[PDB]
Amino acid sequence: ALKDDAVLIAARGYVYTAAVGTAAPTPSQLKLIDLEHPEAWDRTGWDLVGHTSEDDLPEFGFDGGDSEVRGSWQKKKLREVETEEIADYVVINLTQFDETALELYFGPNQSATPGIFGVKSGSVVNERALLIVIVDNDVRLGFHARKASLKREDAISLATDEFGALPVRATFLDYQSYNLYEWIEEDWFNAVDAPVVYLLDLGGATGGDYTLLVGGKSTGDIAYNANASAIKTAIGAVDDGVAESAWTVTADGSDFEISGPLAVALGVDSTTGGSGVTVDVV
Template sequence: MNTDDAVIPAVGYIYVAPPDTLMPPLASIIDPATPDGWGSGQWDSIGNTSLDNGISHAVDGDDPETKGSWQKPNLRLTNPKKTYSLDIKLEDFTVESYRLYYGSSRSADPDGTFVIPESPVAQARALLIIAVDADHMVAEYYPRVTIIGNGAIEYDPANLTEIPVRATVLTGNTADTAYPGKITPRIPIPKPVTPPAPSAPPDVRVWGSGPTYWCAWAPPTTGGSPDGYTLYAYPAASRGDPNSYTRIDVASLIDSDDHPDPPSDLASGWICPSEAISFPDSGDWGLAVTAHNTGGTSTHALTDTSEHITVPA
């Protein structure tokens, strides 16, 4: 019996995004308290939720039934469909909380008030829950849920007021999200990868012209296949100084053979961001990349560009 698999969720974080937003790579969840660095830029915290009541998971559906024949009374057991839901007690009185509770997609009026709709409509979201147990976590991801109020709001002078909502789990609507959800076992929270000074031959390419720049890098030849990569920009004058690196968010990665605008001499099998990248400012810049596994350990020496690129003002 492995006692390390038990979970005490002392702290938790809940995020929502447009429905069918992909789950962030686990290796990018270095700090569960913030979605910075997750790549898509679409995840937003739902805010404070109840400490006393936590999150309740529910399953609704018929019980299995035994079906039999005259010869075999226990011939088959049915597998009725189930509906999953999560009850969450919000504690932030924000427009987003009102949208989810009252069932409306509208914004606040110019005077700051929120109009309660006559006909509520459950709001569709992607949902991500991260339960933190010391330096470990359990992550739950649901590509599409519908959220609506579930119970009364009670103003209790002795406690934080709660806004109860229920998220009903649906199946995602895209080829990449065609399932109800995902959940991890208790896994270590990835550790941040601090970029060291370049120690490997330069093998990161960057090309393009402002404001559209592309890049690609060679996959590691040792250490196995990494779970993720972290891309950095650095001023040309500060090459090798870890304090000068600025992380660049990357939504998704593709093979260089599938790149929409590759240079003619780009090697096959290299790794590329699927979208153009942006540098932090004008000036002379280089790019660097690290590869890491789920635990955040570097598996590939930092590499960088052999030639820097000048970003116009």
């Protein structure tokens, strides 16, 4: 279904890392968590990766994944076969230059003396857990990987007016029978299939009649004191392809549930009392 609440702009976001395997905040915690302070979290061990580029948001790419359509002499297209496997990564453009951000790009500090960061000959291993939180007016698309192997992706960028940047690629590694990686919103994933209810209210009406509008098409006159079976009858009697048995209607005085296969609204109202009729959605 088309949901307008789940279309996402990445307007601000945060990136965290920890020793491999650490649990991210649970999907109920992630909406209450304070993002700038990993020292305050109930899921301890996360810490911030430092500032990250506004121009270069994390690129959730892949490499490999080529495939060909194959078939017999008889039927030319019957399976699509992978030539080589997908491998999954994210590219992160760090911009802070502390040890806390050079360590992801170069690997662990190779010298112990104060005020320097030392580097050795190549092929160091730098596996780390990764958490990312993309935040849009307090909707929070969370992403977590139990293990990722980090490597530098391209040269260190410098400029005279833009920020310098340390582009690092995290490649996702399968860890200890956990998932490869994982997305964390309470309201969007494995959520309960609750049908839409139009919450009609007669609003203190007295005398006269009103008309429902369903799928953009209008029913007849509904009396200010009509019952649930009559309302269900009048919606089902709209010339619009769905039977009466497709609908439900349930009552509490002025309050009604209406629910079924199409959108419901109000056309004309002449019910001469209170606010007149209204229609909310649950």
